[PDB]
Amino acid sequence: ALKRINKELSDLARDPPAQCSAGPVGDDMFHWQATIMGPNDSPYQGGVFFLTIHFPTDYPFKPPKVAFTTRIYHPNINSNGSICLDILRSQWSPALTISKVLLSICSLLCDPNPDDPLVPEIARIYKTDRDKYNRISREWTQKYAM
Amino acid sequence: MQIFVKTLTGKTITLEVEPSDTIENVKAKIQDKEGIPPDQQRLIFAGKQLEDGRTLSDYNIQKESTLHLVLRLRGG
């Protein structure tokens, strides 16, 4: 894993995603992290988000765990920070450029699709009760975003 | 020394600063370089915000490093 993980680091260092910065902590090649800024369109402008990663001891070949330390009231993420990513599913290549994953989350907010996510409660509220959603959206901003 | 800075705009350029300088000064140079004001200028690193009253040697960022620049868009 030390070699594989270092594989992405090469493409990451030489040229890391501009849409979002990321990199491993210390020389410990196992824990990865990233950040995302309000695309300047959705109700979260100026809201900085942080998400940690966890690589398996059996090589990426195993679905990696991801969570959201920041409290985002988006109709697609639960409380435990459960992010819905099809990549993890069959669309999980034992050798994928995590760089694409980060972008997937970026486009998610810049293009959501309220349907049957892991948060049907937020879906309904956002569905018609937009006025309220805006209240919590702005309230959850200063709470942890800022 | 030399240091790389990349913003959301995708803009990337090598800046020049001394290891004894303070984030308070570099902020003055970066803005004059791109033209972006300090209010919108921000410095992030592995999820660590740089303080205005801190020296490069303090954060031990070494040389040939890549700083994550973020734009603080207020709009209100």
Q: How far apart are the first and last CA of chain B?
A: 38
* Residue A108, phi then psi, degrees to nearest 5: -60, -50
CA distance A90 to chain B (A): 30
Interface contact B44-A35, CB threshold 8 A: yes
CA torsion sign for A87, A66, A11, A39 is positive
Contacts of A46 in chain B (CB under 8 A): 72-74
Q: Where are the beta strands (DSSP E) in chain A?
A: 22-24, 32-37, 48-54, 65-66
Tokens standing for residue B71? 């734009």
Please tell me which of the candidates B10, B68, B75 has its beta carbon nearest to residue A21.
B68
Distance CA B12, CA A21 (A): 13
Place of tokens 């894993």: A1
**Domain residue limits at A90:** 1-146
Identify which of A94, A114, A31, A97 has the alpha carbon closest to the alpha carbon of residue A66.
Answer: A31
Q: Where are the alpha helices (DSSP H) in chain A?
A: 2-14, 98-109, 120-127, 130-140
Interface contact B73-A16, CB threshold 8 A: no
| CB-CB contact of A139 with A52 (8 Å) | no
Interface contact A21-B10, CB threshold 8 A: no
Task: Report strand pairing: B66-69 vs B2-6.
Answer: parallel
* Residue A36, phi then psi, degrees to nearest 5: -140, 135
**Domain of A5: which CATH number?**
3.10.110.10
Where do the domains of chain B lie, and which CATH numbers do they carry?
1-76 (3.10.20.90)
Distance CA A101, CA A86 (A): 10
Residue B57 forms contact with A (CB below 8 Å): no
Residue B44 forms contact with A (CB below 8 Å): yes
Contacts of A53 in chain B (CB under 8 A): none
How many domains, chain A?
1
